[PDB]
């Protein structure tokens, strides 16, 4: 008796899939839940690419040695991004390019932030 957007959509998927499954090759099913797809896409739309912080992330850290007059300066950016992506191998280009994509994604992820309400005296 009752109808709805998602229900009629599921019915349409069932009909179209049953029609198209009649012919298949290579001799090697599921109907996705439109509720889950809609919820996921709405959540993704609600996501924020940037992020609001009060203090920027630490860029430089120091390791104190036994010397009272000397110390080492370490760039945190390089020491941590080396863990981004798995090891590289020359036999499989796909994994190499996936690692490249992850590495370039990480820079964009780290570089997007907004300062707001910094604590001052």
């Amino acid at each position: 008796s009752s109808d709805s957007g998602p229900l009629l959509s599921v019915f349409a998927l069932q009909e179209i899939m049953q029609k198209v499954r009649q012919v298949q090759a290579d001799y090697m099913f599921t109907v996705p839940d439109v509720q889950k797809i809609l919820d996921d896409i709405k959540a993704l739309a609600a996501e924020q690419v940037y992020k609001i912080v009060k203090v920027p992330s630490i860029s430089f850290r120091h390791i104190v040695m036994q010397s009272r007059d000397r110390v080492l300066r370490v760039d945190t950016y390089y020491e941590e991004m080396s863990q981004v992506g798995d090891v590289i191998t020359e036999d499989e280009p796909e994994k190499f390019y996936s690692t490249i994509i992850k590495k370039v994604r990480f820079i964009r992820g780290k570089g997007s932030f907004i300062l707001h309400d910094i604590p001052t005296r």
């Binding site: 009752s2 957007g5 009629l8 959509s9 349409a12 924020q48 907004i114």
Partner: protein
Amino acid sequence: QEVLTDFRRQDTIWVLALQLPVNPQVVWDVPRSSIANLIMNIATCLPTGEYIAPNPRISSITLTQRITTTGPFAILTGSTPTAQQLNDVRKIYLALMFPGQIILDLKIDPGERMDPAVRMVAGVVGHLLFTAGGRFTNLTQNMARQLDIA
């Protein structure tokens, strides 16, 4: 007003991560996505509702035919269809609401013994439920021929 005039305040910055006037060419340029586009169109903006029978002030239609011993005198309108017939009427309405993208087609089951009267009056109602030319079509040529023969 929080969506329409709130951006004119002097104490608010709107960072426009997403721009509204999206050109539809981007969505339609992806190859072979007509089915996905139609499905998303149904899912995102179709209203929900109910199927209601006509006014009970309209009696069952009586056929002006000489009586055969097992034929139906009249075809009821308040009778509740089976689930399969509910799916079929859902198909009819779904194709009606999308003019050129979805088309009907007849199917005859080996069983389901039906009197000739129901088909003979469905051939009547078909000429009124659907349009078959001018700008677009809701039914295939085979359906047109079958309805004309009926």
